[model samples]
Target: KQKFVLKTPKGTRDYSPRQMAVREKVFDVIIRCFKRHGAEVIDTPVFELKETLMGKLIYDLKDQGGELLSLRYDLTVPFARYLAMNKLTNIKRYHIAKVYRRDNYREFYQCDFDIAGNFDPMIPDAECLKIMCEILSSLQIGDFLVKVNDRRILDGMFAICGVSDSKFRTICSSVDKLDKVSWEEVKNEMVGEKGLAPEVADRIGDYVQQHGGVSLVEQLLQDPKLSQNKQALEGLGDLKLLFEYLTLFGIDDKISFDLSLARGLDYYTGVIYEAVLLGSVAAGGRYDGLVGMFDPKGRKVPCVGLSIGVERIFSIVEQRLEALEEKIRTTETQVLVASAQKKLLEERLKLVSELWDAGIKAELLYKKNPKLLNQLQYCEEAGIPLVAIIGEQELKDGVIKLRSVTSREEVDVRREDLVEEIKRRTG
Candidate 1:
């Protein structure tokens, strides 16, 4: 016999029911947060023309005809392409959507939250961070950190150290892992494997150490390296203001300056921030010129955005959910009918319907109710907290006897008020 293929791709797996519940929670929270912040929601096709996403939106697959399409790499790119192709000048809009990455085999998901337009870039970024923090707190995800870095500062330091010609992706990729691995390891990997010079590594380390925060960076506009790079310095200034304003608004989320945060994506031009939950849960940044990749628009519209990893967030939420399982298991209420005879059981099921229609999710007793002791014992073992018993006497009385599976307490109410009584007790 041939073996059945039941395995999922490596680095990805199916999300069980327990996992899905938390996933839905995160999805709802992100959407609600965006909506409340006055941002609009949009959906783009899972596939896009290769040429449409060529430069900043994605890499590879560009050589294919317009027919060639891959998974949408990120939401920001789709939005930018939409604007460029459609001549969208409205620039100021926030969006949330799902996005994929190359070689990810769909293991990843991006939480897109961004504003695109001219003038002030920091305003939307600060608002985005504030809203993100609120949702995470609502989900009981504390002990998290928001790390910010400027990709321009990255470019500036690369140029300042006279390594502009050096490979960006390899160096940035190593630096990106600095949070996971130490600075020494990141430097060694970049220099040894990627052919980046050692001096560039030491310069970045010193730059991050000295001018990591907003005030420090803001005060040092006269720095020789920064002064030489106009675009990089200007981008860093925007980020500096954003940091100060975030503190001004009293956003309670803790933040740190991670010089190594290169956010390897090509579109990210300025202030790039990533939210770390034990590890990186979500991240976003300024991609003012990303749309230009789609169409060479002379308009310098600023685009800044981020993506939250839905799969990983759900895993962490599951870990948190495990700690509360004892309370949930002991505290649930399930309605199992208790009548063996067909007609009698049907009458009890009518009451069950009423409870369900009232939005109380009650389970039916699937097994035959031959013996009360055995049937009730089943519920006890399954952690069901309520049972509904109806027989000839119950039909005559116009009420069904309700018994708590835990305390064994009994109560009865008129059929009309059965739903309300069940809700009152169960809740």
Candidate 2:
């Protein structure tokens, strides 16, 4: 016999039924929010051509007499490929699917909602932010703030701050760590490791440290150096417009224009935002250039999207439910067809079939003779609210002894009315 350790792969886990209950609750809220915004659902293959996956953290498949393939690292790239391949210039779509990374939690779900097309600038961008706010609010995980930024703005700041064109990305990467580290720590990486002058790092520090609502955007627009930079002016203008639209949507208070919100993706050409509760929960940005890369003629489809960090949200929600000491029912078995005496297994099966025919969620034990007490105990343990106990007398009377698990109130439910009675009581 072959022997091996019985365990899931590293960074992967099995969800117990109760944990799935939590997972479903979270998904329900998210999916409802997505649909409310008129987003149609879509899906893609779990793996794509290895070359199609641009990141370094991908899990590549071994040679199997086919094109080299790798598990998707995120949902965004696949969505772009889908749009380009189908020649779909416009779509408001959401994809809830698993992506694989070579790092911890190698396999995970990405809930992405994106609007792809060329509309008025910052219009779809505002909607993406609104969607993020709607989902975070609907989840009720607690208050969250979305720190908004523009890549163009970051690049403009880099130019004005004396950061070389070559070092813009690496320096932006260092700035992205500001959320988890202090400015001094980030400056060290900039000036020490990235080889930036102290003055340039300080200049970047001064701008990145400033964050606020639209007023901050207005203030930056008037700054001599930032105003002179054409890219910064465009970004500041768009952000100002985005705030106006978000204000109309009544979510302006949840948005912050932070200079330090440098999203660590090379594809983002415009607006970027990250929503934070205790930590960053959801983040995405405009990638107008991404879809074009997959197109034959480099045709661009301006896309703005956001990815909900479902795993982190799941943990927060699970922790909250656990703290509240709430009981989560794993199964929906509404009523158990129970036997009160020996050799009533046939009767129990017949009744359960009737319940099943009536579209009632019902269950029964496999044993030929199960004690009524044990059957009722099963309901109690499984959190089934009702139990329909059949016995010799009940058979003669053509009724079921329907007992409420919580109240322990037993009532004689007529055989014909059993399904309706269970429905009414369960409802």
Candidate 3:
């Protein structure tokens, strides 16, 4: 087969029944957590006009019927856009669905949970983080740290480094790649590729390492030189309050303050954060400058939110589940019917109907003989617990033989009471 034909499109997915069962098992737990936090579900379009999505004037819907629509890269952005456009200023809503992205076509489902309303970014943001810890703990995910930072801190660094317009984008790109690439390699990229000053890149790396993760604001405040950057310091203070609240609520075990977490998303202005399992897994924060650009009144709306990379979480949990030492013990299935005689097809059908009607998951055996041993092997293979065996003797006698696969015991019951007898034994 050709390579192209063998692979799915970059960010798409395929799920089998077993995998879907596992996913549902996990989702059911998370859903309980989501409801406990007072969040409501909402879904957005998989495709929207590029103009409306890209923040253009959106009148081209008529002339350009189906041209360049953009897939919603995530939930928050679209929610913000929708709220700003439609003036939907009431109610708390959240969404879970397959989001699209142009830059990332990597495989995995992303589960995003966020609550938005007309409010301060900091208040909603702090609440959102606190909410995540509960969900994580309930999902059996540990307090793994939540590293945070502010765009202003990086903005301060940009100023100190005297970033050029031509190299600004490059530097931000380099900073965002800090996780995937080495500091030394990133420095090389910044200096060699973006023309960043060697000393500046080194200083940026050192400062971020020393003060970037979580509670750097209090530390930065003590430092006269760094504290002078008002925008950056104020942002740090905002982050510290977030950390304090999380700690206040007894979630310190699961959270931390990281000053180095430069949110790569351009629109983010205040506190930004990332959550990881003993390592980084999900990242999101405050984006305060988004709505104004699209607003007719140019009114800026502040919002803070979080998103969990469903695919990433699924991968880690899958690995852990596979490595678990305990074996899976499924419940035993007991009810079965045995008959191969064509004349008994109608009888078997009747028995099958009566089993379902009686709320028993009964299986019909098609072999000619009703011997218990033969039915035993079939039951064992089928993972069944109860076998119903009826030979010519039992058929003529109007009695049915009910055998317990678990205890290897048998009991005789009249044909009229066969359904109720199996039900009693199984129940």
Candidate 4:
């Protein structure tokens, strides 16, 4: 004999029927927005070639006779590879699925939307921001701001601040941590650990802290220090153009040209955008070279996309519902074909099938002869609103007694008209 352990694995738990109802609502909103933007859905396998997953979990094939394989950590890498293998030059696609990470269980439902292929500068980039605004606004979560930046702009700022090209990315990473730490702490780390000059660190601070609308873009564009650097000028031009397009989309007011919006992804090459609601609810950017890395000829295809932080969104929605003291009905059963007397189980089942055949949601008890109280109790517990009661008198009279679960009101309807009666009541 052995004792059993009752527990779900760490960081992953089963979703009850009630939770599933909420999950369905989330998916409905996401898929609706994806289709609104002319995005066709795509799917990738759960496992892929180990090298594609960063080779972080390479394991020996003990008894198998094949190459190493690992579960996909994220869908973006495989999506890039997919474009290269098929030589697809353009696509507007969306993928909603799960991903694995070895560092922690970190269960997530990732909803990714990407526009891949080269086009006008910041054209698709602005569209990415617009779609994010639409989805977040539709969710009604709360107030949010979409912060935008350019990597080239960061490089140009570093150059102007006297930081070498070799240390640009490393120092930018430290600057990226500004949201969580203080300016003084970041300056010390830059000067002490990363070996940045104190003056240069301070200069970088003056610029990265600056954030605003079109006027800020104009200021950075005309500044003697930032304007002289060709890279900085180009980044400023991209922002200016991107903001114009955002205005056309009517989302410019929600846009912030922030210098601190440095995304940690190395592959990002052009404009970057992140939407913050209480925290970051979505993020993405242009990666024009990611696909080229997978191509034999290094054929570059520009890409811009965003991923909705579904876990955070779910948390917000769940908390709101909890705070409101609401309970979600788990079942869709509209009517219960319950019997009020003995030996009428067969008649009740017949009524259930009749209702079902008419495209109604109906159920009958499994027991041969359940008590009238037990039958009504099941209906109430399941949140079923209607009960079609069948008994000896009603059957002989060629009618069925229909009762409202909530109001407890009873009415008699013709047996032949019972299905129609249910539809009228439910609707």
What are the lDDT scores of the predictions, listed in order?
0.69, 0.87, 0.66, 0.84
Tens digits of per-residue lDDT, candidate 1, 180-230, equal: 787778778877866766777787667654524555666556676677787
Model 2, 1-427: lDDT tens per residue? 8788898999888889988998899899989988899999988998899888753677888997989998988887888788777888799999998888888388888888889888998889988988888888888888889998998898898999998878878898888988999999999999877799999988988999998999999999989889999889998999999999999999999988889987756778899889999475898889887776777776777888888888888899889988988778999899888877887899888888989999999998999998878887888889999888889988898878888999999999898887887888878
Q: In model 4, which runs have C-alpha deviations exceeding 4 angstroms?
A: 1-10, 55-63
What C-alpha RMSD separates each model from the true structure?
4.3, 2.0, 5.1, 2.4
**Inter-residue clash pairs, candidate 1:** 91-116, 111-307, 111-308, 284-306
Put down candidate 3 lDDT per residue, 293-396, tens digits, no spaces. 66677666666667765666665666666777432224344577865333565566677667777677877766444555676777776667777765667778
* Candidate 2 TM-score, C-alpha based: 0.95
Per-residue error (Å), model 4, residue 386: 2.1
Clashes of each: 4, 0, 13, 0
lDDT of 4 by residue, 78-125 (tens): 897788677788999999988766552445678899998778888888
**In terms of TM-score, which candidate is stronger, 2 or 3?**
2
Question: What's the lDDT of the predicted structure labeled candidate 4?
Answer: 0.84
lDDT winner among the candidates? 2
User: Which is better, 1 or 3, measured by TM-score?
Assistant: 1
* Top TM-score prediction, candidate number: 2
